[PDB]
Amino acid sequence: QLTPTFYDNSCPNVSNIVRDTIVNELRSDPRIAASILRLHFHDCFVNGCDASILLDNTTSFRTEKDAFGNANSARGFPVIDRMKAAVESACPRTVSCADLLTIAAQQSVTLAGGPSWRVPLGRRDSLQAFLDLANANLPAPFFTLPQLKDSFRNVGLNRSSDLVALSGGHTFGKNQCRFIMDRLYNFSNTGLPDPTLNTTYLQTLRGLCPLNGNLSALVDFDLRTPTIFDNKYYVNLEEQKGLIQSDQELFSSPNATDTIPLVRSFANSTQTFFNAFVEAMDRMGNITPLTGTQGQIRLNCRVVNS
Ligand code: HEM
Numbered sequence: 001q002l003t004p005t006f007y008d009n010s011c012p013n014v015s016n017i018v019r020d021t022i023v024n025e026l027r028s029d030p031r032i033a034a035s036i037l038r039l040h041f042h043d044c045f046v047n048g049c050d051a052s053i054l055l056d057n058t059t060s061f062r063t064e065k066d067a068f069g070n071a072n073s074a075r076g077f078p079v080i081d082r083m084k085a086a087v088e089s090a091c092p093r094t095v096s097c098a099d100l101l102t103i104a105a106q107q108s109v110t111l112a113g114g115p116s117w118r119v120p121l122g123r124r125d126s127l128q129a130f131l132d133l134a135n136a137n138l139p140a141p142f143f144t145l146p147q148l149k150d151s152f153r154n155v156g157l158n159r160s161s162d163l164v165a166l167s168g169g170h171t172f173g174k175n176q177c178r179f180i181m182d183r184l185y186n187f188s189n190t191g192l193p194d195p196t197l198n199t200t201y202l203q204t205l206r207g208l209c210p211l212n213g214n215l216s217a218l219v220d221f222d223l224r225t226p227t228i229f230d231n232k233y234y235v236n237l238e239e240q241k242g243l244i245q246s247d248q249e250l251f252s253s254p255n256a257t258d259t260i261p262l263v264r265s266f267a268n269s270t271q272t273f274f275n276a277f278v279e280a281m282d283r284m285g286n287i288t289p290l291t292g293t294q295g296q297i298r299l300n301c302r303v304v305n306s
């Protein structure tokens with residue numbers, strides 16, 4: 001079983017070293033907290049939180065960094081290297097990259113103003129990466145609600161609360177114009193915008209993402225508080241101001257009978273949202289972990305120990 005006190009004897013200062021690394025990076029890159037949380041999410045949705053996403057290419061297996069959900073999107077890898085090196089210096093061969101990334105995600109959420117809690121620990125590192133699995137398992141912004149639900153259930157998260165609370169990760173961070181172009185100009189081959197997108201916000205987004213414009217341009221997931229981890233994401237949904245299709249569907253999909261009440265509850269109470277987010281985060285962090293003597297304690301998160 002994973003436990004929050006796993007390193008209290010072997011590396012009591014791990015969380016503090018992780019936090020310091022993020023605080024320092026945030027001064028030059030205010031987006032890093034969001035980026036780190038997403039790295040953890042994409043690690044857990046592919047063979048569990050086993051740091052498989054951190055592995056680079058080898059002649060025997062491809063890196064997950066080239067998956068459709070990671071390529072030209074996932075970022076922050078050098079920062080993870082930096083904190084890993086610091087932790088290795090403080091406590092040699094003790095903290096796994098899988099655990100390191102989990103702590104980094106929690107600390108990132110807290111530093112951004114979110115809830116503070118001690119994540120379960122004891123995960124170990126994978127001996128390979130899974131590109132095909134990443135392409136199959138990572139959800140896409142154009143998924144319908146049934147597909148989003150299918151994606152979460154596929155990795156072990158059956159609850160609507162898991163999906164609604166974790167989607168709250170979009171209370172901060174950036175998104176490329178590429179992923180919303182259809183909603184703005186030609187949704188589902190209608191030549192018209194997505195009707196569930198607020199028309200006033202539609203104009204704002206069209207201004208940021210013009211037709212035939214820079215598809216790589218970045219837009220904030222949360223128009224209310226772009227870099228603060230709070231429940232504003234849900235208030236946006238209630239006003240049809242979710243940025244991507246997968247966001248708005250939680251509130252507007254014909255299949256949202258079970259998700260709508262959750263969206264409202266999280267929009268109405270920060271405490272309700274924060275509690276649900278921590279619960280969902282720990283559940284996601286509990287997806288098929290390698291424990292005990294399974295896997296290893298990777299020294300360089302980019303390569304398997306030899
Ligand atoms: C429900 C399905 C989800 C879909 C389809 C989805 C999709 C995406 C997409 C399209 C981006 C934009 C990437 C880019 O343009 O570079 C992104 C970014 C992000 N996602 Fe999600 N996401 C989902 C769930 C989650 C979850 C569960 C979390 C974490 C708890 C999360 C956290 C983030 C964060 C924080 C960013 C911003 C990262 C940055 O700015 O570097 N996402 N997501």
Ligand SMILES: [Ca+2]
Binds near residue numbers: 046053
């Ligand atoms: Ca993984």
Ligand SMILES: [Ca+2]
Binds near residue numbers: 172
């Ligand atoms: Ca926010």
